Amino acid sequence: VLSPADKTNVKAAWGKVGAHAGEYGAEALERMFLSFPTTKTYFPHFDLSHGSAQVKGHGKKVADALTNAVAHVDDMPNALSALSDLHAHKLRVDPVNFKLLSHCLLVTLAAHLPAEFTPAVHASLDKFLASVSTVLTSKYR
Amino acid sequence: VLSPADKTNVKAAWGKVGAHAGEYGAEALERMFLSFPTTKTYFPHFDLSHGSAQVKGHGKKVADALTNAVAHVDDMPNALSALSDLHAHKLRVDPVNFKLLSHCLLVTLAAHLPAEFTPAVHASLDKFLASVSTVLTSKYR
Amino acid sequence: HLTPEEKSAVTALWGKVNVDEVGGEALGRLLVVYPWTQRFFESFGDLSTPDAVMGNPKVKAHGKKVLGAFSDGLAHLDNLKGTFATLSELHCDKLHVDPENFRLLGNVLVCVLAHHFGKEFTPPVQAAYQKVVAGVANALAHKYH
Amino acid sequence: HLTPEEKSAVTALWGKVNVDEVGGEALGRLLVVYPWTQRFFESFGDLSTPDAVMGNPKVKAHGKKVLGAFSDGLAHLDNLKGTFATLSELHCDKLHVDPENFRLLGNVLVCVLAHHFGKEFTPPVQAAYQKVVAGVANALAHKYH
Ligand code: HEM
Ligand code: HEM
């Protein structure tokens, strides 16, 4: 579960992302596609070249959903309800890939938040992305 | 979540297991040790040869815990709370190993339940063991 | 690396497998147990309930084809990468199938063999089949890029 | 396998690494972020808080040891199995370290290199290091039995 301290750590670190969430979401996706190429099997309909409008747009959606989740961290299941439905019933992305994007979002944050990425914050952020991932795969079966 | 049909399926299948639960728990551990040899790193104090009484006694404990979980299927976190504490803070089994023992439990059940292991029952049992596994790793961090 | 006891155990059990029937059963169970896997089978008809998936003629037909290629790979256990290279490229470039699906099919196929064969699918026999399903999924994932 | 450019990028970034410093940081972060990995270090003293783990001299000392071996292994990117074979047998037979711990440490190492190098740890550089940390993990797990 996310402790109160975890929630405090996530709100502070993600709050610092602020206006860059679009950019960081896109970089995390590029990081994932390059490091873990099997994740590209879910985006054959996208131009995945560097800087593409589709990756930038999708990056913003992913980061705004995380903003929503940070903002409603005490009730993520209800706040991400439409997105858990979309992933479970339509996108149907294998659950193993959520750990891959989560790792890449964590690297992205580490690379852009030098002052804020302490060991404690790193653990809280890892736990939060895992909890978001659990909610997004909660209705798969 | 486990549905009403999943809970009925789990109780019917485990109910047929009946008094062979302990034998089947030891067989699932044996299946795990042979199939996934890295899981043997948690038992250096055990003779893991076929027929071992240490594996059989451990198998009975695992099976009795599963019986307890089936009995409290709507209140699993509290029924397994002491085992969650033990695995999180003493044994400290990496969470990836729970999916290996769950698959071996599933295989052991399939090999002993010709009539009951239908596709639906297989799916409910898989969900059940993943939910038990999730409760057992819930206090790890 | 399968041992010689392991290779013999795999071959001996495979002489009893009706590949067409087991393929149909394993693919149908994959679609029932991990239903998100139905994303690759949109044109296959009725997948609404377990019984509909299991009796679906297209599911049964594909299962036969899939396990037929798997069966053919059992004659080449020292060269699975080369045996499945063409199908790996196909699954990556044209079918866009995440290789985690090959791992899920491998586990369902082990469960089907255990259900069908019972006691004969012993711990050691299972261990030999786990090595084989892991090897085939790794071979089919090898040409992804 | 790493491409020639990927080998060059790994070598170039590693030339700027303080191995003792990064080792102590990565091992402490492993114990903080994945606390079940503390199971091997009950003789190490205080691991009661994040600050206590990071400041623990025995944790730092073990980090220096593990990453020093990692560092030396980067001269043998074409023979990681051979280079880590005896360490693989030791970690299995005597130390009983589940190889998943090697993957978790590789994930923490990537996060630490990202934190340390910032924008210099680009997506392509990360992709290269991911191959290296999966390669070392796989080499350290290869002699398990
Ligand atoms: C942190 C975990 C994730 C979050 C927060 C997330 C969020 C989102 C959002 C907000 C959308 C767009 C929904 C809309 O337009 O209404 C989306 C779509 C999508 N996601 Fe997820 N996602 C996550 C994980 C994943 C993973 C791991 C994959 C596959 C590797 C994935 C594949 C997709 C795809 C293919 C789409 C549709 C893209 C398009 O066609 O525009 N997602 N996701
Ligand atoms: C369905 C999942 C599991 C259940 C229900 C379960 C249950 C139990 C139980 C009931 C005990 C005995 C507790 C006591 O003596 O008070 C136990 C101990 C233990 N378990 Fe777990 N366990 C599970 C998964 C695992 C896995 C996946 C591993 C490692 C591969 C593991 C490793 C151990 C070890 C090493 C012990 C201590 C045995 C001894 O020294 O006697 N368990 N578990």
Ligand code: HEM
């Ligand atoms: C043992 C593992 C597998 C083997 C050996 C295998 C083999 C094959 C073969 C021989 C074909 C027909 C090729 C052709 O038309 O040229 C095929 C097609 C296909 N396979 Fe695989 N397969 C495997 C697993 C899977 C899994 C797990 C999935 C997804 C869950 C999958 C998805 C597909 C799809 C979507 C097609 C095309 C079906 C269509 O024609 O609509 N395969 N595979």
Ligand code: HEM
């Ligand atoms: C990059 C991955 C790793 C490398 C290259 C590595 C390397 C080494 C080396 C060189 C030694 C000393 C061997 C000897 O004394 O003969 C060692 C010992 C040890 N390693 Fe690993 N290690 C790695 C990861 C890990 C991890 C992740 C853990 C557990 C979390 C671990 C647990 C241990 C333990 C407990 C010892 C014994 C320490 C002592 O006796 O002071 N290692 N390792």
